[PDB]
Amino acid sequence: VRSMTLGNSTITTSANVVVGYGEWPSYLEDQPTQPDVATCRFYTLESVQWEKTSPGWWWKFPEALKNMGLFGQNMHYHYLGRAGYTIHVQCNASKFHQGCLLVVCVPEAEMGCADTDTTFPATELTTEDTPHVFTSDSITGKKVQAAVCNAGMGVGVGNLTIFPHQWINLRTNNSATIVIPYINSVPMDNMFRHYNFTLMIIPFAPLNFTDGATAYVPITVTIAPMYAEYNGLRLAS
Amino acid sequence: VRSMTLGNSTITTSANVVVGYGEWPSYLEDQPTQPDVATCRFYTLESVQWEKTSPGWWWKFPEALKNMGLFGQNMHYHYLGRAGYTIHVQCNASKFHQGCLLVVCVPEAEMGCADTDTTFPATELTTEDTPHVFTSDSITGKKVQAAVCNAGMGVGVGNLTIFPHQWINLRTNNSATIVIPYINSVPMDNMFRHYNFTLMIIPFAPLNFTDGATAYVPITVTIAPMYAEYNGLRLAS
Amino acid sequence: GVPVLNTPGSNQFLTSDDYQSPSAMPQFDETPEMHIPGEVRNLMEIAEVDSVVPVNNVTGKTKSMDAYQIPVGTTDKTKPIFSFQMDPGYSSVLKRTLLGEMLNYYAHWSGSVKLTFLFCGSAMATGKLLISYSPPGASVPTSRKDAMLGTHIVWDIGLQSSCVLCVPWISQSAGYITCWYQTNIVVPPGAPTSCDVLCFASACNDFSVRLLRDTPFMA
Amino acid sequence: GVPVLNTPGSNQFLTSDDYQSPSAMPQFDETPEMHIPGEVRNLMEIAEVDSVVPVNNVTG
Amino acid sequence: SRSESTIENFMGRAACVFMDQYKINGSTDRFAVWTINIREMAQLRRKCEMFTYMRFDIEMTMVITSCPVLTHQIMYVPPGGPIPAKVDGYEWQTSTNPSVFWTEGNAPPRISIPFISVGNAYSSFYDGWSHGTYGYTTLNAMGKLYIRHVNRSSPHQITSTIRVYFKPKHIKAWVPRPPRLCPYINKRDVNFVVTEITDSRTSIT
Amino acid sequence: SRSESTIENFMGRAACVFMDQYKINGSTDRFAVWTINIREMAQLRRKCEMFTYMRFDIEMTMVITSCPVLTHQIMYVPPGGPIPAKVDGYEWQTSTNPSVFWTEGNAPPRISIPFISVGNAYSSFYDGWSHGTYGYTTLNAMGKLYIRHVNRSSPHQITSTIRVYFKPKHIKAWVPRPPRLCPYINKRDVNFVVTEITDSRTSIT
Task: Write down which chains contact chain F via at least 3 CB pairs under 8 A.
Answer: A, C, D, E
CB E127 within 8 A of CB B109: yes
Give the three-class secondary structure for B217: strand
Sign of CA dihedral C36, C38, C43, C44: positive
* Pick from C53, C54, C198: CB nearest A205: C198
Q: Please give the helix or strand (H or E) that residue B74 lies within, else none.
A: helix B69-77
Compute the nearest-CA separation of E75 from chain C (Å): 10
Tell me whether the omega of the peptide bond preceding residue A131 falls within 30 degrees of 0, making it cis: no
CB B236 within 8 A of CB C168: yes
A76 Cβ partners below 8 Å, 6+ apart? none
Distance, C-alpha F150 to centroid of its chain: 23
Cα–Cα distance for residue pair E140/E57, rounded to 1 Å: 13
Whether residue D36 and residue B183 make contact (CB cut-off 8 A), yes or no, is yes
CB F9 within 8 A of CB C105: no
Sign of CA dihedral B172, B173, B177, B183: positive
Way the structure was solved: cryo-EM
Instruction: Of A135, A139, A141, give the one whose Cα is nearest residue A202.
Output: A135
Q: What are phi and psi of A22, to 5 degrees?
A: 65, 15
> What is the per-residue burial (b if ≥16 Cβ within 10 Å, else e) of A98-132?
bbbbbbbbbbbbbbbbbeeeebbeeebbbeeeebb
* Pick from B155, B162, B186: CB nearest E119: B186
Cα–Cα distance for residue pair F158/F147, rounded to 1 Å: 15
Sign of CA dihedral C86, C89, C95, C99: positive
**Does D28 contact chain F (CB < 8 Å)?**
yes
Is A50 one of the annotated binding-site residues? no
Instruction: Of A92, A89, A104, A91, give the one whose Cα is nearest residue A148.
Output: A104
A68 Cβ partners below 8 Å, 6+ apart? A43, A129, A223
- Residues of A with Cβ-Cβ distance to F126 under 8 angstroms: 108, 110, 194
CB E10 within 8 A of CB E43: no
Instruction: Of C176, C171, C182, C174, give the one whose Cα is nearest residue C206.
Output: C171
3-state helix, strand, coil in chain D (%, to 5): 5, 10, 80
Cα atoms found within 13 Å of the Cα of residue F161, Cβ hemisphere only: 14
**Does D32 contact chain C (CB < 8 Å)?**
no
- Residues of A with Cβ-Cβ distance to F193 under 8 angstroms: 116, 138
For residue B68, give the CATH number of its domain.
2.60.120.20
Cβ neighbours around C67 below 10 Å, total: 26
- Residues of B with Cβ-Cβ distance to C131 under 8 angstroms: none
Size of interface C-F (CB pairs under 8 A): 171
Q: Please give the helix or strand (H or E) that residue C148 lies within, else none.
A: helix C144-148
Q: Please give the helix or strand (H or E) that residue A72 lies within, else none.
A: helix A69-77
**Does C5 contact chain E (CB < 8 Å)?**
no
Whether residue B158 and residue D53 make contact (CB cut-off 8 A), yes or no, is yes
Compute the nearest-CA separation of D28 from chain B (Å): 19
> What is the per-residue burial (b if ≥16 Cβ within 10 Å, else e) of D1-37?
eeeeeeeeeeeebeeebeeebbbbbebbbebeeeebb
Residues placed in the known binding site of B for guanine: 24
Compute the nearest-CA separation of C216 from chain D (Å): 20
Whether residue D58 and residue E118 make contact (CB cut-off 8 A), yes or no, is no
Burial of A228 (0-12, 13-18, 19+ CB in 10 A): buried
Size of interface C-E (CB pairs under 8 A): 54
CB C52 within 8 A of CB A169: no
A175 Cβ partners below 8 Å, 6+ apart? A13, A14, A88, A89, A90, A91, A168
**Does C111 contact chain B (CB < 8 Å)?**
yes
Task: Give the CA distances from residue A7 to residues A73, B4, B166, F168, in Å, rounded to whole numbers and listed in that order.
Answer: 17, 87, 92, 48
Instruction: Tell how strand A18-19 and strand A175-179 pair up.
Output: parallel
Cα–Cα distance for residue pair C39/C47, rounded to 1 Å: 15
Strand ranges inside chain A, DSSP E = 3-6, 9-12, 18-19, 43-44, 48-50, 57-61, 81-82, 86-90, 98-104, 132-133, 165-169, 175-179, 197-208, 217-224, 229-230
Cα–Cα distance for residue pair C185/C205, rounded to 1 Å: 34
> This structure's resolution (angstroms)?
3.2
DSSP F7: H
- Residues of C with Cβ-Cβ distance to B237 under 8 angstroms: 166
DSSP C180: E
Task: Give the CA distances from residue B193 to residues B63, B119, B120, in Å, rounded to whole numbers and listed in that order.
Answer: 8, 16, 15
Compute the nearest-CA separation of F74 from chain E (Å): 19
Query: CA angle, corner A118, sides to A113 and A119, nearest 5?
Result: 50
Whether residue B154 and residue E180 make contact (CB cut-off 8 A), yes or no, is yes
Query: CA angle, corner E64, sides to E60 and E68, nearest 5?
Result: 140
Cα–Cα distance for residue pair A163/E141, rounded to 1 Å: 40
Strand ranges inside chain B, DSSP E = 3-6, 9-12, 18-19, 43-44, 48-50, 57-61, 81-82, 86-90, 98-104, 132-133, 165-169, 175-179, 197-208, 217-224, 229-230
Task: Give the CA distances from residue B146 to residues B158, B204, D16, in Å, rounded to whole numbers and listed in that order.
Answer: 16, 16, 42
Cβ neighbours around C151 below 10 Å, total: 19
Whether residue D28 and residue F13 make contact (CB cut-off 8 A), yes or no, is no
- Calculated CA dihedral for residues A64, A191, A110, A52, nearest 10 degrees: -10
Q: What are phi and psi of F30, to 5 degrees?
A: -95, 5
Instruction: Tell how strand B175-179 and strand B18-19 pair up.
Output: parallel
Whether residue E127 and residue B154 make contact (CB cut-off 8 A), yes or no, is no
Task: Give the CA distances from residue B190 to residues B179, C136, E116, in Å, rounded to whole numbers and listed in that order.
Answer: 21, 12, 22
Looking at the structure of chain B, the number of domains it has is 1
Give the DSSP letter string of C28-86.
Answer: --PPPP---S-EE--SHHHHTS-EE-----BSS-SSSGGGS-EEE----SSS-SEEEE-
Cα–Cα distance for residue pair F154/F42, rounded to 1 Å: 37
DSSP A82: E
- Residues of F with Cβ-Cβ distance to A149 under 8 angstroms: 194, 196-197
Sign of CA dihedral F198, F201, F203, F205: negative
Give the three-class secondary structure for F11: helix
Q: Please give the helix or strand (H or E) that residue C103 lies within, else none.
A: helix C98-103
B and A make contact (3+ CB pairs below 8 Å): no
* Pick from D3, D6, D22: CB nearest C17: D22
Distance, C-alpha B101 to centroid of its chain: 14
- Residues of F with Cβ-Cβ distance to E68 under 8 angstroms: 66-67
Compute the nearest-CA separation of E16 from chain B (Å): 25
Cα atoms found within 13 Å of the Cα of residue E107, Cβ hemisphere only: 20
Q: Please give the helix or strand (H or E) that residue F9 lies within, else none.
A: helix F7-11
Distance, C-alpha E110 to centroid of its chain: 14
Cα–Cα distance for residue pair F87/C50, rounded to 1 Å: 55
Whether residue E101 and residue F63 make contact (CB cut-off 8 A), yes or no, is yes
Instruction: Of A230, A57, C56, give the one whose Cα is nearest residue F197.
Output: C56
Alpha helices in chain E (DSSP H): 7-11, 42-48
Query: Which residue segments constitute the domains of chain C, with CATH numbers given?
Result: 1-219 (2.60.120.20)
Pick among D18, D27, D39, D43 to test the E interface (most E CBs inside 10 A): D43
* Pick from C137, C166, C169: CB nearest B30: C169
Give the three-class secondary structure for E8: helix
**Does D42 contact chain E (CB < 8 Å)?**
yes
Whether residue B195 and residue E127 make contact (CB cut-off 8 A), yes or no, is yes
Compute the nearest-CA separation of C175 from chain F (Å): 14
Cα–Cα distance for residue pair B31/B234, rounded to 1 Å: 9
Interface of B with E (CB under 8 A): 21, 60, 107-113, 116, 119-120, 122, 125, 138, 145, 147, 149-150, 153-160, 162-163, 183, 185-187, 189, 193-196, 198
CB E61 within 8 A of CB E110: yes
- Using CA coordinates, name the residue in chain B closest to C164: B237
Instruction: Of E157, E204, E162, E156, give the one whose Cα is nearest residue E63.
Output: E162
Assigned CATH class of E1-205: mainly beta
CB D24 within 8 A of CB E111: yes
